[PDB]
């Protein structure tokens, strides 16, 4: 995030990090419950990719994180490569997540919920702080 | 260069789709939602990430980082997958598995 702010460790329990076999963090994700994660369809996640939960400092060697394996990927078939519309993917874990203080789920809205423009929201992640 | 190690957070306002078209024209579909253009922006590595807002006490996933300015411009808004337009698909998926 550009101009973002270092968060309080553990204050965003559903935020997960997705990493490939080579170990690179390429996308973020959100736990909607113990067995599922929601991310972007364009992240092109595979079952050899790993979901890391409960982490704060990726450069730490002492924090207790949960490296969860992925059982199956479900990319919204409506996703369009040309328009990037319907950019969503659901991940079913093999290694269920164990919820607690630092690892929790985020809520899902209903199809009819309306979030008015001007509403102050929040976004988190391990994206570049400058491009 | 290299993705940051510590988790980052940022506050930002949502925009109506009509407003968003100001920056992205016809590339903004009904299944998307924009936020930002307020001195903050999502950058490489944040995609798939969450965009949460409060609804009676709880942070709800309103958006999922999707795409935006190629330079991570703080003067242009980022685009997100509008979860309300996708929750139906999500629900079906969780049931079929």
């Amino acid at each position: 995030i550009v101009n973002g702010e270092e968060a309080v460790p553990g204050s965003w329990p559903w935020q997960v990090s997705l990493q490939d076999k080579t170990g690179f963090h390429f996308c973020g994700g959100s736990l909607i419950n113990e067995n599922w994660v929601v991310t972007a369809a364009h992240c092109g996640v595979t079952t050899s990719d790993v979901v890391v939960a409960g982490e704060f400092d990726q450069g730490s060697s002492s924090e207790k994180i949960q490296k969860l394996k992925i059982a199956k990927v479900f990319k919204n078939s409506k996703y369009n490569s040309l328009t990037i519309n319907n950019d969503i993917t659901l991940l079913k874990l093999s290694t269920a997540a164990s919820f607690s203080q630092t690892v929790s789920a985020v809520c899902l809205p209903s199809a009819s919920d309306d979030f008015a423009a001007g509403t102050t929201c929040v976004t988190t992640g391990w994206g570049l702080t400058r491009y | 260069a290299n993705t940051p190690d510590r988790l980052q957070q940022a506050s930002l306002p949502l925009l109506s789709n009509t407003n968003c078209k100001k920056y992205w024209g016809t590339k903004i579909k009904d299944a998307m939602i924009c936020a930002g253009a307020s001195g903050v922006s999502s950058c490489m590595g944040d995609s798939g990430g969450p965009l949460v807002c409060k609804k009676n006490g709880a942070w709800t996933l309103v958006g999922i980082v999707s795409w935006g300015s190629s330079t991570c411009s703080t003067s242009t808004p980022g685009v997100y997958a509008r979860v309300t337009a996708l929750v139906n698909w999500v629900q079906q998926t969780l049931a079929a598995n």
Binding site: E5, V8, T102, S104, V122 | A58
Partner: peptide, 11 residues
């Protein structure tokens, strides 16, 4: 869901 056990602090 949505209620962090460790409350988030922003600026």
């Amino acid at each position: 869901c949505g209620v962090p056990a460790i409350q988030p602090v922003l600026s």
